[PDB]
PDB file of C-alpha atoms in Angstrom:
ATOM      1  CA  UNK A   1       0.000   0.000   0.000  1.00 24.02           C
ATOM      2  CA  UNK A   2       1.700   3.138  -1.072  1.00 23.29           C
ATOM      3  CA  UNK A   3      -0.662   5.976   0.475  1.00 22.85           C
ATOM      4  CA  UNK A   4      -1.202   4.282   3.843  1.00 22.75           C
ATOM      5  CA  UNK A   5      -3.785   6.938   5.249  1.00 24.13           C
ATOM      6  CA  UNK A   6      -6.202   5.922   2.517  1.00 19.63           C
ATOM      7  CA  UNK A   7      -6.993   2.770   4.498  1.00 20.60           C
ATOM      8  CA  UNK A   8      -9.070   4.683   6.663  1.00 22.77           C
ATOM      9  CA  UNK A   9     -10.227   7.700   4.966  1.00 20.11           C
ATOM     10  CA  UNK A  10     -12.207   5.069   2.860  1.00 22.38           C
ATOM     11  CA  UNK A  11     -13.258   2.270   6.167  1.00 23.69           C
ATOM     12  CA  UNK A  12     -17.023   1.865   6.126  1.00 22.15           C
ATOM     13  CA  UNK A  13     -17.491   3.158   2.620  1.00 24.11           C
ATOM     14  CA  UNK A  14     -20.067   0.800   0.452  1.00 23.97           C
ATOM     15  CA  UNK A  15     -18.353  -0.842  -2.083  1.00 24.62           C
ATOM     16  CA  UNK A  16     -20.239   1.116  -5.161  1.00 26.00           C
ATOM     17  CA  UNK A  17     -18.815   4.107  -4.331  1.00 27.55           C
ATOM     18  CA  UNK A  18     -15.197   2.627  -3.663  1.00 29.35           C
ATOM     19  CA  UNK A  19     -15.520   1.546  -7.230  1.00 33.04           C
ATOM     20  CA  UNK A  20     -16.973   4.998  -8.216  1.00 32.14           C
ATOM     21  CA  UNK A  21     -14.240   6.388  -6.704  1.00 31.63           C
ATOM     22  CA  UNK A  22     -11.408   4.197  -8.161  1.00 30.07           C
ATOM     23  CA  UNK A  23     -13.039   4.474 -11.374  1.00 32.63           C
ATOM     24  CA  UNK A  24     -12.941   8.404 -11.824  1.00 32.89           C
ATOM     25  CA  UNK A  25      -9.122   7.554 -10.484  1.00 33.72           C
ATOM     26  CA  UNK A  26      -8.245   5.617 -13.377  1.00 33.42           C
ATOM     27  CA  UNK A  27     -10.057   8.535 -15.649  1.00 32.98           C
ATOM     28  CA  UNK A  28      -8.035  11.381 -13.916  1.00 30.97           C
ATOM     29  CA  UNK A  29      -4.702   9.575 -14.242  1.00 28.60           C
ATOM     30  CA  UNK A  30      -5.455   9.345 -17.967  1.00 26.03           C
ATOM     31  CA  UNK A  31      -6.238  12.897 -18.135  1.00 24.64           C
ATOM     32  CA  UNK A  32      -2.985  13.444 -16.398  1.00 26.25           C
ATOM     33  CA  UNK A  33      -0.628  11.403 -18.126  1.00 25.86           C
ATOM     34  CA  UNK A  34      -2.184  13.109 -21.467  1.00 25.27           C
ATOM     35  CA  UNK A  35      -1.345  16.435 -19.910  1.00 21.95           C
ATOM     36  CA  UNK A  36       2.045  15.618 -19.170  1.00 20.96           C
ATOM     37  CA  UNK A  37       2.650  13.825 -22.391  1.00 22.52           C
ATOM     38  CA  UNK A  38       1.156  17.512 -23.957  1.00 20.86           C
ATOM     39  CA  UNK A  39       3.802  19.250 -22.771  1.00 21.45           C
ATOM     40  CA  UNK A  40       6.844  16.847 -23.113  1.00 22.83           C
ATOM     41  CA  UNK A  41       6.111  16.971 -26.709  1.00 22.37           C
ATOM     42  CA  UNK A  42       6.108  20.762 -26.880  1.00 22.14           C
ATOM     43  CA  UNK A  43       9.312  21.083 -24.815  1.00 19.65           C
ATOM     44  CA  UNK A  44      12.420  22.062 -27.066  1.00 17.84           C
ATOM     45  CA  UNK A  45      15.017  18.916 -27.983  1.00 19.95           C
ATOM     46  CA  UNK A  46      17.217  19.350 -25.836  1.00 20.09           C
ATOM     47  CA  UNK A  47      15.031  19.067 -22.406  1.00 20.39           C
ATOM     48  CA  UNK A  48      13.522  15.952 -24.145  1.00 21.67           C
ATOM     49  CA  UNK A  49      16.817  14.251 -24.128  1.00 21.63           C
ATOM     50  CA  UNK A  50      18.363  15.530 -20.805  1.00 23.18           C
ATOM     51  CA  UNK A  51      20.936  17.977 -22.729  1.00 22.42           C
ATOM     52  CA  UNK A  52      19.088  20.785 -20.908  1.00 21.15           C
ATOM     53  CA  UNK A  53      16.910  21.589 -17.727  1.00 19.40           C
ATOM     54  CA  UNK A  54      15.465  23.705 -15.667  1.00 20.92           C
ATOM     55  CA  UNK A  55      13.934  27.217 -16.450  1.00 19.11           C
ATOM     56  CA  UNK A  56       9.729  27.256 -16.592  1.00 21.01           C
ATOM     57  CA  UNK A  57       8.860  25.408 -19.326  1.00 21.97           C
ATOM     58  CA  UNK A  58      10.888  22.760 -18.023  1.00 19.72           C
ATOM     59  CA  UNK A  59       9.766  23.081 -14.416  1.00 20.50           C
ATOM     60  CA  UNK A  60       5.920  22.955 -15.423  1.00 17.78           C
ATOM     61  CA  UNK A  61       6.096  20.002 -17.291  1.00 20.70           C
ATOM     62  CA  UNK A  62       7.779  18.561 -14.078  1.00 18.64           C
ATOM     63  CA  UNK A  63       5.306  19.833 -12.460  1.00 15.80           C
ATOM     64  CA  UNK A  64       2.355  17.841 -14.394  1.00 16.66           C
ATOM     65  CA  UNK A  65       4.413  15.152 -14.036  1.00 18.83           C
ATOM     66  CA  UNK A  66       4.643  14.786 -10.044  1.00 13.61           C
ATOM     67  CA  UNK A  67       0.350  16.018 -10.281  1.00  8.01           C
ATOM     68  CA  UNK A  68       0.350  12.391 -12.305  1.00  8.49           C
ATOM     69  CA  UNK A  69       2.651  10.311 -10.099  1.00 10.68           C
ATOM     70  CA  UNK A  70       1.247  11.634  -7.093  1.00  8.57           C
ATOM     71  CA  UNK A  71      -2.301  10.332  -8.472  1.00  7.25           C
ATOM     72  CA  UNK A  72      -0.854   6.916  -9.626  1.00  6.70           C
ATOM     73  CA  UNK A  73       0.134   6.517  -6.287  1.00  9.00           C
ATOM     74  CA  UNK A  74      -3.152   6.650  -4.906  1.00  9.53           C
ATOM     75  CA  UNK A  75      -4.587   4.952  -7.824  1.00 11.66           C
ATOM     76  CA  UNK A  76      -2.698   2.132  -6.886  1.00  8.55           C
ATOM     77  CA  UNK A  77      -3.839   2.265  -3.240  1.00  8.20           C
ATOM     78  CA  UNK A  78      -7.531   2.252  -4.432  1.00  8.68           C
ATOM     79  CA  UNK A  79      -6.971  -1.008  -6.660  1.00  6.81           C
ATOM     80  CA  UNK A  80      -5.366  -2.637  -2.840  1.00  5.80           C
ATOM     81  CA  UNK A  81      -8.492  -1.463  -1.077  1.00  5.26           C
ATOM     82  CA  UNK A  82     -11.074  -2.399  -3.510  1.00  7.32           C
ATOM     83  CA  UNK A  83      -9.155  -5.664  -4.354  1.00  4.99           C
ATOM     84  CA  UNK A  84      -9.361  -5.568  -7.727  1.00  4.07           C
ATOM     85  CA  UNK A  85      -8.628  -3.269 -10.822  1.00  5.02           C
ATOM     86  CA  UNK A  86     -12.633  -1.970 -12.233  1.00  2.54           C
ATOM     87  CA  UNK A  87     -13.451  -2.796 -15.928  1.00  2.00           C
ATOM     88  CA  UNK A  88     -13.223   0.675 -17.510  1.00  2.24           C
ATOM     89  CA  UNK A  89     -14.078   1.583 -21.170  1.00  2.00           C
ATOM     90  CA  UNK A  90     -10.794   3.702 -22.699  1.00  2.00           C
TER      91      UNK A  90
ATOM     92  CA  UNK B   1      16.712  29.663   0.498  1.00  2.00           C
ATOM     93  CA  UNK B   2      15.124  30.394   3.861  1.00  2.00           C
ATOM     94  CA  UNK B   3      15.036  27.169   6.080  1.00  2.00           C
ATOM     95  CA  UNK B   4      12.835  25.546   8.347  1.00  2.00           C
ATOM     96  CA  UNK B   5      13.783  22.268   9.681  1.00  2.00           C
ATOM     97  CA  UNK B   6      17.067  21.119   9.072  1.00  2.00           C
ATOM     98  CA  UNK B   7      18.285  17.391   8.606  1.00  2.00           C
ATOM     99  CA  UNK B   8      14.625  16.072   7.999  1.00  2.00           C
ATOM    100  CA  UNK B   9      13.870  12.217   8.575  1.00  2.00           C
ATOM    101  CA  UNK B  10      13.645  11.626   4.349  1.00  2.00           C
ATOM    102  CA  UNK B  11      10.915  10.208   3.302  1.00  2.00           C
ATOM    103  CA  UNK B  12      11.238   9.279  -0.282  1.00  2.00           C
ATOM    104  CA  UNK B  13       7.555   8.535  -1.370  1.00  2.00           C
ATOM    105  CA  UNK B  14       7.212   9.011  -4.607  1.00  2.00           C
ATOM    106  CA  UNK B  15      10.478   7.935  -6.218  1.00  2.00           C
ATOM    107  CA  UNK B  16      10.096   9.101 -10.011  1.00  2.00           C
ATOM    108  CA  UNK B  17      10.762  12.742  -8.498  1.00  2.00           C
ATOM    109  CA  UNK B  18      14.023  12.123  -7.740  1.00  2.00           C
ATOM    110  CA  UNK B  19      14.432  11.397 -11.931  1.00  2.00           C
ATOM    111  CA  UNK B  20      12.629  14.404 -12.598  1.00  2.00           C
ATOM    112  CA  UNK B  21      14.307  16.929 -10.561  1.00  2.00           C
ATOM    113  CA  UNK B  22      17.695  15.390 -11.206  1.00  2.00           C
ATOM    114  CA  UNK B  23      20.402  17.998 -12.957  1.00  2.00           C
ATOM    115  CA  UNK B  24      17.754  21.116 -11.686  1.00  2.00           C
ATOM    116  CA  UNK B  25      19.435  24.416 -10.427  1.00  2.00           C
ATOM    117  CA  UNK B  26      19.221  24.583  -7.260  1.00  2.00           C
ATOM    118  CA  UNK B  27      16.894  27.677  -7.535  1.00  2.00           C
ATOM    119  CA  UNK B  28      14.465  26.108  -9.525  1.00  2.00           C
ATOM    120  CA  UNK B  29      14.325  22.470  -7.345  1.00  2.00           C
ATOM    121  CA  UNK B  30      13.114  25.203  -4.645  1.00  2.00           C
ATOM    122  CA  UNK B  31      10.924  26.876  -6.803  1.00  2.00           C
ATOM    123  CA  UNK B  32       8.493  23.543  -7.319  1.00  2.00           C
ATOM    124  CA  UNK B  33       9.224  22.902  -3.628  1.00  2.00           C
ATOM    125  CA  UNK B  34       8.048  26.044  -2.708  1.00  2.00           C
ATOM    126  CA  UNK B  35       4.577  25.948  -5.104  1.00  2.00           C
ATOM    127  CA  UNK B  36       4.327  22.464  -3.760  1.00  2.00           C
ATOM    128  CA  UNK B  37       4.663  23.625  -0.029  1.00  2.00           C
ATOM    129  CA  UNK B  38       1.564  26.477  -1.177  1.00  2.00           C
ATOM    130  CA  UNK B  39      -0.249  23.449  -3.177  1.00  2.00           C
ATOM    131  CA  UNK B  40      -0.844  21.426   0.423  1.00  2.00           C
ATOM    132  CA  UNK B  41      -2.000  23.696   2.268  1.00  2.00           C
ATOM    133  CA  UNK B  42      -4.673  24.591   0.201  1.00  2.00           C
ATOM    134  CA  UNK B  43      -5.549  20.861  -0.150  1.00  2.00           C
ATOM    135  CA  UNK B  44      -5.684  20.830   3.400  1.00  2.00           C
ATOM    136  CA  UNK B  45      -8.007  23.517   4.015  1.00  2.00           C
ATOM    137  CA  UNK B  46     -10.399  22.341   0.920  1.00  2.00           C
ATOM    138  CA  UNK B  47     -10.447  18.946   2.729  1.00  2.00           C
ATOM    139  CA  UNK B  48     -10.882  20.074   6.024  1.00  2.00           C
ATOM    140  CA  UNK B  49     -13.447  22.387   5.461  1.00  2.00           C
ATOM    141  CA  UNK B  50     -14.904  19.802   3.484  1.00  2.00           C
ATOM    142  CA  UNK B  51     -15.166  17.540   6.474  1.00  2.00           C
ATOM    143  CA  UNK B  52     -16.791  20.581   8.217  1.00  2.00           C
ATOM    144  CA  UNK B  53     -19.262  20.812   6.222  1.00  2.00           C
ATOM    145  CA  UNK B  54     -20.306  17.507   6.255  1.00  2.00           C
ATOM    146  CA  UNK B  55     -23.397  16.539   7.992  1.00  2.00           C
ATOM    147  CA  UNK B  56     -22.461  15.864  12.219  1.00  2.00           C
ATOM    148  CA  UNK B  57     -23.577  11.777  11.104  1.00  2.00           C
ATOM    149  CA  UNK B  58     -20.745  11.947   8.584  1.00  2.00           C
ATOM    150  CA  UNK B  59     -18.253  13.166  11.210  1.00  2.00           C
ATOM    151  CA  UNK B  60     -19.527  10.847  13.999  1.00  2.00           C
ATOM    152  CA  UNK B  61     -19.273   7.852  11.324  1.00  2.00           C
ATOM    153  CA  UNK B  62     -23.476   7.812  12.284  1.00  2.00           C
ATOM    154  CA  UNK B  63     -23.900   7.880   8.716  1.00  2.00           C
ATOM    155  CA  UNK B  64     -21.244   6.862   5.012  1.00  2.00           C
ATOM    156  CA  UNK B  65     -22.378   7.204   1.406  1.00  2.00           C
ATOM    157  CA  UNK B  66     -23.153   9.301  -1.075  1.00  2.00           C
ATOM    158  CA  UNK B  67     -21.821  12.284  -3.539  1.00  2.00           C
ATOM    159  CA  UNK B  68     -21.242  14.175  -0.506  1.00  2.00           C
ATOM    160  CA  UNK B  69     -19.308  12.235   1.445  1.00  2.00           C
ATOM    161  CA  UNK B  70     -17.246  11.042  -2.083  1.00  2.00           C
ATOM    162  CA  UNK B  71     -15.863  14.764  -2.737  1.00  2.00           C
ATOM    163  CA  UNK B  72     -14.874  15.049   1.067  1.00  2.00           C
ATOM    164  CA  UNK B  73     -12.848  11.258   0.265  1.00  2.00           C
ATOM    165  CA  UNK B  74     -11.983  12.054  -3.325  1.00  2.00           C
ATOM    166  CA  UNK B  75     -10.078  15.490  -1.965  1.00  2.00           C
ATOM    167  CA  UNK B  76      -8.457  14.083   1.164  1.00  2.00           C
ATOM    168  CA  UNK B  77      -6.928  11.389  -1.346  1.00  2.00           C
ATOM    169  CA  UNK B  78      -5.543  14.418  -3.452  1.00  2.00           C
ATOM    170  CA  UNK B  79      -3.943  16.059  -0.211  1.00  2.00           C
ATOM    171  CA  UNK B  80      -2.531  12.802   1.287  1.00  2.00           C
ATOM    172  CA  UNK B  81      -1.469  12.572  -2.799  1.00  2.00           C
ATOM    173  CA  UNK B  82       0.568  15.039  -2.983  1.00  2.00           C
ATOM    174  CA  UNK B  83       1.839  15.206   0.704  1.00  2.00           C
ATOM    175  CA  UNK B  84       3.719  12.059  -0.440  1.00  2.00           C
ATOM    176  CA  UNK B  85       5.594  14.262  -3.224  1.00  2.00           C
ATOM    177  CA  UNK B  86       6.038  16.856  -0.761  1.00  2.00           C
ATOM    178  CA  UNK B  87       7.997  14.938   1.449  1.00  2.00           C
ATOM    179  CA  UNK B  88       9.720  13.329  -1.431  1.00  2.00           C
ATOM    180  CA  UNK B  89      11.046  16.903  -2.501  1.00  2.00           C
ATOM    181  CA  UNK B  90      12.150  17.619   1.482  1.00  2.00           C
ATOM    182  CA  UNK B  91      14.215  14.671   0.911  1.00  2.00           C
ATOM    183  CA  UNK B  92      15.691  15.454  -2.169  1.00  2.00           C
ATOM    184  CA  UNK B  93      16.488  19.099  -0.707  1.00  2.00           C
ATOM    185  CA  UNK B  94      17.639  17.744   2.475  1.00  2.00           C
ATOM    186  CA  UNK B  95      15.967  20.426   4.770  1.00  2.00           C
ATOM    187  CA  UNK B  96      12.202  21.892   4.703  1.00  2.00           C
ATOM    188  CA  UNK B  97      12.183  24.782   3.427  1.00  2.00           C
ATOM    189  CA  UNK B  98      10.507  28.252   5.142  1.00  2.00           C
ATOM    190  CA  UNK B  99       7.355  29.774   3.571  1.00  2.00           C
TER     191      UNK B  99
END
């Protein structure tokens, strides 16, 4: 279990909205990983290949990127609570 | 820049930070620290006022369920979410920062 308070944020919760919840997870974390794939792809060359970095392009796209892990992280947690990964339609 | 705690008890949480931030000026690795220090807080208040506002058989645990009681859940996950960077990004720094 990566995000240990989780556990008991969710105790007592029916099992429908666990699911829900897990389910608009795994839709966020999409959204996010499309966001930080968005601007990778706009960031000059040499960032992409690790020639350069820093300054604020670089720094927001890092930025989107640790909003993403952060999530996956809990995503994770949900799918060890709920004991199971939901179907969901991509 | 300004410091808060030194010699922190490092956490690392989230470990794909420590990639990220790699080769970053020192300036900027305290720049995202900084906006991430701002970030939390916020979270926190949004999740505690959250719980505030729920009704007193949501607080007591009298009463679970519902779209309510999901957005108090779905933003204490986001705090707790990026709490776990946070302290990932104290541990790459070394020290907590002041803000």
């Amino acid at each position: 279990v990566e995000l240990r308070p989780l556990i008991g944020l969710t105790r007592g919760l029916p099992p429908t909205d666990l699911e829900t919840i897990t389910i608009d997870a795994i839709r966020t974390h999409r959204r996010l990983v499309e966001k930080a794939d968005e601007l990778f792809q706009a960031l000059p060359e040499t960032y992409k290949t690790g020639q350069a970095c820093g300054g604020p392009q670089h720094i927001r796209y890092i930025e989107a990127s640790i909003e993403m892990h952060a999530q996956m992280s809990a995503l994770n947690t949900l799918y060890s609570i709920l004991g199971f990964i939901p179907k969901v339609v991509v």
